Ligand binder design. Structure first.
Ligand SMILES: CN1[C@@H]2CC[C@H]1C[C@@H](OC(c1ccccc1)c1ccccc1)C2
Ligand SMILES: *[C@@H]1O[C@H](CO)[C@@H](O)[C@H](O)[C@H]1NC(C)=O
Ligand SMILES: *[C@@H]1O[C@H](CO)[C@@H](O)[C@H](O)[C@H]1NC(C)=O
Length: 528
């Protein structure tokens, strides 16, 4: 009971629900993003969470070692590793910013208050631009000294020192902590509720605009955010569930996890939009013109909310300590999963583990050094747009198609019944077989066909930036066909002989050899 309670609480609050969710909610309107989020969640987030839990718990192997049930579909074990590496590249800049803010918040006069600092412009408006946004973009990022993604400039030494500290802390780390976010968020929520002009920001939150529901960006954003929040599509759920006993049940875990995650996301968006409405009322501007729909929205929103609070310095220190802890936890989880999977896959990198871990850490630091330069927000935006999205949805769709069609929904249900004593009902089987793959395929095709170039406020990325982004997405996406070709060419025999062992499970060896392959009959495919 205590261990199970602490298990659900751990996944409840993370960097996805605190940082990315309000950004994507403000970008898409507020309710026109809430509707697709719930629609995609209740349909294809719980079934995939349950499927990943059961697969990991039964196979008792890592992200790549599970695929002995469909030997040809193993490139999705390296696709997820590449995706996690790409995410971890830009996942450290958030922690560097948090460290910078925590260090700079150790004073009696906060710097994001008034328009008298050396990093200000004649456009600054004290109750143009706000002092908090001007501080973030001109005294921390120094974005005004870069023309665009073409003109980056040398890295800054302060953010480089913060990055080095983050890297060493992560490497050496790789009751009180688990309850600080709840208290801090409750204080912020109460303060935002009891503020003038918050009702407008709440009305703008709980109101659906049908004109944006006919687009595609909001559907793609909701689909990607569901996977980012729940944790599916990264290969960490399978690795974690590899040690989840055998008799532990998975549907009860999935239901509670999904419910708590949804509640936390809703509360975070509520707080952010309430403060947005207050500031819009204060500055005599509409809610849609307060700030830019960029990744650094919380770093502009939250300093002002702390400033409107008594004893603002202590609250600032506590908030940024909490943010640093959350980022460290998420980064540790991702890097641990990547390293463990790579070590397990190759038996050569087992006598040399510390060297491999040091090499991975060094490479991640070197490739994350690109976002510390003057124009690093452009590289951050490009990575955020292109590392996840089409690649993660493609990997999730391939995993679902494999596990369901190529293996057997009935066989998966029989395995689950053997594991836990209860065979899944018709809702789960139908969702695994038909409902989820169709909605994933539609989203993938829509995302691929539609253009949607990235931008940062008013900067428009050139053609070569989009080409590079598509290159780095395709690099992760294209691990399935190459492994399929290698596996097909490695097996011996003829076309039928190779195809028999390429798709049948490794537990089916004694039966495929004696002229009996289950995947060669219509009844196997036509069953739900
Ligand atoms: C990209 N990774 C990040 C966030 C999503 C995916 C999953 C991974 O898991 C974390 C985690 C922490 C809190 C909430 C949700 C996920 C994790 C940390 C420590 C130990 C295990 C897992 C971290
Ligand atoms: C702003 O800065 C100037 C010069 O640093 C200083 O003299 C002044 O007192 C500050 N405040 C106002 C309200 O001008
Ligand atoms: C400041 O405002 C003026 C318009 O009054 C605008 O032309 C200029 O580009 C602004 N400066 C910056 C750095 O955005």
């Amino acid at each position: 009971k205590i261990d199970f309670l602490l298990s659900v609480i751990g996944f409840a609050v993370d960097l996805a629900n605190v940082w990315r969710f309000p950004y994507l909610c403000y970008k898409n309107g507020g309710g026109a993003f809430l509707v697709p989020y719930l629609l995609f969640m209740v349909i294809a987030g719980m079934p995939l969470f349950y499927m990943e839990l059961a697969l990991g718990q039964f196979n008792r192997e890592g992200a790549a070692g599970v695929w002995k049930i469909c030997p040809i579909l193993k490139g999705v074990g390296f696709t997820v590793i590449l995706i996690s590496l790409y995410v971890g590249f830009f996942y450290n800049v958030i922690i560097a910013w948090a460290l910078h803010y925590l260090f700079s918040s150790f004073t009696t006069e906060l710097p994001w208050i008034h328009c008298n600092n050396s990093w200000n412009s004649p456009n600054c408006s004290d109750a143009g631009t706000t002092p908090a946004a001007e501080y973030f973009e001109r005294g921390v990022l120094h974005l005004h000294q870069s023309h665009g993604i073409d003109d980056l400039g040398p890295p800054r030494w302060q953010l480089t020192a913060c990055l080095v500290l983050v890297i060493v802390l992560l490497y050496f780390s790789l009751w009180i902590t688990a309850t600080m976010p709840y208290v801090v968020l409750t204080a912020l929520l109460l303060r935002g509720v009891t503020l003038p002009g918050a009702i407008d920001g709440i009305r703008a939150y709980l109101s659906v605009d049908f004109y944006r529901l006919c687009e595609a960006s909001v559907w793609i954003d909701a689909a990607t955010q569901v996977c980012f929040s729940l944790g599916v599509g990264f290969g960490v759920l399978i690795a974690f569930s590899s040690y989840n006993k055998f008799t532990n049940n998975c549907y009860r875990d999935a239901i509670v996890t999904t419910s708590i995650n949804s509640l936390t996301s809703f509360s975070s968006g509520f707080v952010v939009f309430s403060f947005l409405g207050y500031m819009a009322q204060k500055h005599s501007v509409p809610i849609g013109d307060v700030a830019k729909d960029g990744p650094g929205l919380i770093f502009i929103i939250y300093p002002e909310a702390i400033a409107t609070l008594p004893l603002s310095s202590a609250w600032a220190v506590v908030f940024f300590i909490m943010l640093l802890t959350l980022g460290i936890d998420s980064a540790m989880g991702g890097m641990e999963s990547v390293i463990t999977g790579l070590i397990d896959e190759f038996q050569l990198l087992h006598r040399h583990r510390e060297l491999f871990t040091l090499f991975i850490v060094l490479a991640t630091f070197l490739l994350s050094l690109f976002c510390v330069t003057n124009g690093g927000i452009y590289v951050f935006t490009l990575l955020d747009h292109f590392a996840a999205g089409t690649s993660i949805l493609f990997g999730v769709l391939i995993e679902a198609i494999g596990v369901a069609w190529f293996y057997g929904v009935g066989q998966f249900s029989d395995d689950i019944q053997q594991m836990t004593g209860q065979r899944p009902s018709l809702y789960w089987r139908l969702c695994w077989k038909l409902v989820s793959p169709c909605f994933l395929l539609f989203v993938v095709v829509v995302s691929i066909v539609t253009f949607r170039p990235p931008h940062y406020g008013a900067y428009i990325f050139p053609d070569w930036a989009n080409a590079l982004g598509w290159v780095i997405a395709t690099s992760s996406m294209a691990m399935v066909p190459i492994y399929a070709a290698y596996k097909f060419c490695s097996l011996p025999g003829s076309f039928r002989e190779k195809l028999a062992y390429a798709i049948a499970p490794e537990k089916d060896r004694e039966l495929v050899d004696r002229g009996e392959v289950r995947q060669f009959t219509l009844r196997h495919w036509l069953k739900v």
